[PDB]
Symmetry: C2
């Protein structure tokens, strides 16, 4: 009995699934225990066939925590999210069981199920309930990076120093790394890009050279739009890991702005060759053909990124931009809106909608989009206006009149000019706005840039420290 | 220690993202080979095998634990040469002993050997493979899969001895069940049914056992009894797809498009990645007389598993119906590469070569099918009679070429032409005095006749001759 199910798990840790599953089937058939049942369902699940585990556990119902966790997980895998809640929460039919109840039920598993419950609440439009779950999970288990990483991406600001603290002593040490890292990834998610590099770079060199860190730093340099400083450490994460696709996502697009045909070609090849069930590889393959500026082929790839992961915002976004160039404005809208559906904090899509409203001269709505976007990210304009540059290389008073009422539409019109090689025209429109809004740091920060490129070093430094002082 | 134990917790709840992160940390922190093993174990269980491979290659893996995981990724990546060179092979070491491998991998010895046997079986070295399997089983007789493979690749181990322990309750069960599966594999199905229906009824009523029985009844061509057992196996185990491809073929021989529709709909959208489900839908649309829609599905079955022989043979039959024999020969030809011990294609080709009047070839083929399974004519000849819904020539060949004559009598028996088949089987019976097969087919025809004397006698003759 005992040695039979000892032996099954030996088969599973060696991934001999057919051997394990066979024994499990006979074990459960001899003795109908809840533990043997669990083990069988376990075997079906790790063998890569969740659906089997679902019908098995479901058909003669077990209530044990080990079965309940697993049954909920198979559901989540199969997108039965509403159901998944009910197994764990007791959520919607009867009264919703509390976290204190949940912890009592699952005990040591409480941390994964709250993580699980977290994920579904978030993916079912209840970030409120989902954040509370993630937080509680981290309380129960500080070694879990994923809950913390979800909270940052939502817009929540958890406290690294309070989140990771265990309550020889090896944890203390691991949590220290995790602390400065936590502080840094939040610092990246809220777009304190200079801070995030500063925190991450101060991290010890062994944990600096890891591809995760460098990948985040790559995202950091990229958001600043220091493209060459970015491509340096993305070329780096590749020679050091070479099996990593996760950061190569945004690296593909950096190589896109720099217009490095061979490198993006090489990346797309190397990425598709490794993992064709990765939206990153397909995002890369996609804008490799945008580089070559053929739009039929790129659309198809971006699509594969959507099929292999429809909860992956960025892939939707990158399609929109490409449809802008082909002048398919109606498809583009739906793209950015969908992008807004999966992640409401993905700034690229807001602005992209706002850009095409502005382009069609629907301003007061474009404002709202630009505003909601620039709240997520200031200095959004640089990247998405550079986009239009890359494309166009391969009423104006009406707007200013309209711009009287609303600042950000105007601000784009300036950012749109600086991105083009029309530097002088920008400064006329800029001062007119500087008078319109002496509140916004954005205005003084742009003057800072526009002076630097014009030579006036003393007057650039000047307006930037003002711009900083006005900034909160 | 706390970090390592925290990972394994995250793994056992399938929180892969949480675990790889700790494992990247732990490995960055210490460049330990066990820290390495964890990271690669976390990438592999995350469902990203390439990630572990590329990692393990780019660092020094020299330990059994490490060497196993890497071999597994290789084999997963269709890098069989690599896989071999890692477990058996020293770049510098010579071909390892069986005993060397066991020493190196200790408890993991049975699994590494199992995986080798698979590699040997995937390459053209069956003998080297079945030796690796036997060794695996002797090291660990709780493993069913190596013995499963042994039966299918034509070898005949002895259950009573092979699963003897060198607990008694599992083995004694395994032995009886093993003896049953071997029978099914050696195609003495009436034995296979008998010997595993002697099993205790709560292991009888498991899905796997019923499936083998159901499998057997198709091989006995007991089609109405077959669908009885499957239908039950469906009720018991609606999540089972394994062995339900042939349930579909049961519902195809019997002409139940109604039930084959229920079956295919269910299986398709239960498991799109199972070829059994696409074989199921493939048969379904064959009945509906949509040949194009039928072949569409059979290729998808093949698409989902190119090492799934039965989809190749079903495409074949669907091609012969559309008289596209060049394409049909290829499928069957593909089928045999794919399946060494598979009567279906061998006979399938035979029937094609027989219709091409190339009886010299047809013979050699029918022998190979009939070597694997003696009764293959009855099923394959039935196919033609469902699909449908010189008399001197083959007689002269029937001197030198007996098998071509037997098939001609079988196809006549498969049609309602019972009288004409006895006449022809008598003439052929003179040419071969003694062939168990022939006395069987007499008894087969006597059932339709009435006559207990003729059926009983001949069957009893045929049995005695081939002990």
């Amino acid at each position: 009995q005992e040695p039979v199910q000892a032996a099954i798990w030996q088969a599973l840790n060696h991934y001999a699934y057919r051997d394990a599953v066979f024994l499990a089937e006979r074990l459960y058939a001899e003795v109908h225990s809840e533990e043997a049942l669990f083990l069988l369902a376990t075997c079906y699940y790790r063998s890569g066939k969740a659906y089997k585990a679902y019908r098995l556990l479901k058909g003669h119902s077990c209530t044990t925590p080990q079965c309940k966790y697993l049954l909920a997980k198979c559901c989540v895998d199969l997108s039965k999210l509403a159901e998944g809640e009910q197994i764990l929460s007791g959520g919607v039919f009867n009264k919703q069981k509390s976290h204190d109840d949940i912890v009592t039920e699952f005990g040591d598993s409480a941390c994964f199920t709250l993580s699980l419950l977290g994920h579904v609440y978030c993916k079912t439009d209840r970030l409120a309930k989902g954040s509370e779950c993630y937080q509680k999970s981290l309380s129960l288990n500080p070694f879990l990076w994923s809950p913390f990483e979800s909270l940052c991406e939502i817009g929540e600001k958890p406290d690294p120093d309070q989140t990771f603290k265990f309550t020889k002593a090896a944890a203390e040490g691991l949590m220290s790394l995790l602390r400065e890292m936590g502080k840094g990834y939040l610092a990246l998610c809220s777009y304190n890009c200079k801070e995030a590099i500063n925190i991450l770079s101060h991290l010890p060199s062994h944990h600096y050279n890891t591809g995760w860190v460098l990948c985040q730093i790559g995202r950091a340099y990229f958001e600043l739009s220091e493209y060459m400083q970015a491509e340096r450490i993305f070329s780096e994460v590749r020679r050091i890991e070479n099996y990593r696709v996760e950061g190569m996502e945004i690296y593909s697009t950096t190589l896109w702005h720099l217009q490095k045909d061979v490198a993006l070609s090489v990346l797309s090849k190397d990425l598709t060759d490794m993992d064709k069930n990765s939206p990153e590889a397909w995002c890369a393959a996609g804008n490799c053909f945008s580089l070559q500026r053929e739009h039929d082929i790129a659309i198809k790839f971006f699509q594969r990124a959507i099929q292999v992961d429809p909860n992956y915002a960025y892939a939707y976004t990158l399609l929109g931009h490409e449809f802008v160039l082909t002048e398919e404005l109606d498809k583009a809208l739906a793209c950015f809106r969908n992008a807004i559906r999966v992640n409401p904090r993905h700034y690229n899509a807001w602005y992209g909608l706002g850009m095409i409203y502005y382009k069609q001269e629907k301003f007061s709505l474009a404002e709202m989009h630009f505003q909601k976007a620039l709240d997520i990210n200031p200095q959004s304009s640089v990247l998405l206006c550079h986009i239009g540059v890359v494309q166009h290389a391969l009423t104006l008073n009406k707007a200013i009149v309209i711009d009287p009422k609303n600042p950000l539409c105007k601000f784009h019109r300036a950012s749109v000019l600086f991105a083009n090689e029309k530097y002088k025209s920008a400064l006329q429109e800029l001062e007119e706005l500087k008078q319109i809004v002496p509140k916004e740091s954005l205005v003084y920060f742009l003057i800072g840039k526009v002076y630097k490129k014009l030579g006036q070093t003393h007057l650039a430094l000047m307006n930037f420290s003002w711009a900083m002082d006005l900034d909160p």
